[PDB]
Amino acid sequence: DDKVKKEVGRASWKYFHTLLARFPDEPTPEEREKLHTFIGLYAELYPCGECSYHFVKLIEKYPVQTSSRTAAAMWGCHIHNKVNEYLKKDIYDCATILEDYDCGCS
Amino acid sequence: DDKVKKEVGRASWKYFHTLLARFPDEPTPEEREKLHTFIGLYAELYPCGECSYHFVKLIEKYPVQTSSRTAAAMWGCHIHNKVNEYLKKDIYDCATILEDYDCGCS
Numbered sequence A, B: 001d002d003k004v005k006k007e008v009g010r011a012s013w014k015y016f017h018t019l020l021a022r023f024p025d026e027p028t029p030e031e032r033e034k035l036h037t038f039i040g041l042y043a044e045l046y047p048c049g050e051c052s053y054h055f056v057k058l059i060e061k062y063p064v065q066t067s068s069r070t071a072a073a074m075w076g077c078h079i080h081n082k083v084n085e086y087l088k089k090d091i092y093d094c095a096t097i098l099e100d101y102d103c104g105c106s
């Protein structure tokens, strides 16, 4: 129900923004191509009917910015804010988008 | 640092298993290929170099089963258990894999 959608959404966003924060600063044409294809599949395969419906249209209306890490993670913050806007939720400050989602990795 | 990686990991698995449990029972050939492609990028783009390296090897050794929701969900559980075994963590019983992740299919 509403519960599941909320719990899954939170986990997904956490993974989503962390993934983008790791995208390279100088992506190659192939990497830019891969992120583009991943996003399309991410949207199409998202585990919630209405969510996928809305999200597929959003990414086509505002395609993922793949020129760089900053552009991609920022696009992620902007796209998530489009969902927030849609759900009447607060808009998140994107000023520390990379720092907010460190991979905690090497 | 390691606590962040673990948090990112938990969030990713939650999303991952739910996605597999929401895949169609009767997928079309195109949906099957999209899932195959998605999993390849998911492994390739995971937010941790070492994790990604090992996971890519795993999905190649154990390619995703896309014939149905159940096959895909079962595959996801086994693949996660391969990571568990790798990190010397306990094995997870896959007997109720669909239910555990709100397949909305019971």
Ligand SMILES: Cc1cc2nc3c(=O)[nH]c(=O)nc-3n(C[C@H](O)[C@H](O)[C@H](O)COP(=O)(O)OP(=O)(O)OC[C@H]3O[C@@H](n4cnc5c(N)ncnc54)[C@H](O)[C@@H]3O)c2cc1C
Residues within 6 Å of the ligand: A005, A006, A007, A008, A009, A010, A011, A012, A013, A014, A017, A046, A050, A051, A052, A054, A055, A076, A077, A078, A079, A080, A081, A083, A084, A087, A089, A091, A092
């Ligand atoms: C691709 C996708 C599409 C979705 N579509 C819908 C839908 O159509 N209908 C519906 O009911 N639900 C939808 N959801 C669910 C929804 O977006 C929320 O995940 C959910 O309702 C839980 O809300 P929340 O308040 O806990 O914050 P979320 O929106 O889950 O919160 C993520 C957390 O990340 C942070 N955050 C918030 N905004 C941003 C941002 N802009 N950039 C970076 N971090 C941010 C904050 O710390 C916050 O607590 C979707 C989820 C995903 C992942």
Ligand SMILES: Cc1cc2nc3c(=O)[nH]c(=O)nc-3n(C[C@H](O)[C@H](O)[C@H](O)COP(=O)(O)OP(=O)(O)OC[C@H]3O[C@@H](n4cnc5c(N)ncnc54)[C@H](O)[C@@H]3O)c2cc1C
Residues within 6 Å of the ligand: B005, B006, B007, B008, B009, B010, B011, B012, B013, B014, B016, B017, B043, B046, B050, B051, B052, B054, B055, B076, B077, B078, B079, B080, B081, B083, B084, B087, B089, B091, B092
């Ligand atoms: C693609 C991917 C690759 C990863 N690779 C590495 C790596 O190489 N090295 C490293 O240090 N970390 C890696 N991680 C992180 C790691 O697997 C864990 O997420 C993390 O250490 C935290 O573990 P946890 O014990 O809290 O449970 P996780 O293993 O995070 O648990 C999620 C939870 O899901 C359930 N669960 C457990 N096993 C299964 C299963 N088999 N099927 C369905 N549900 C299950 C349980 O409820 C458990 O609480 C990876 C994560 C992902 C998503």
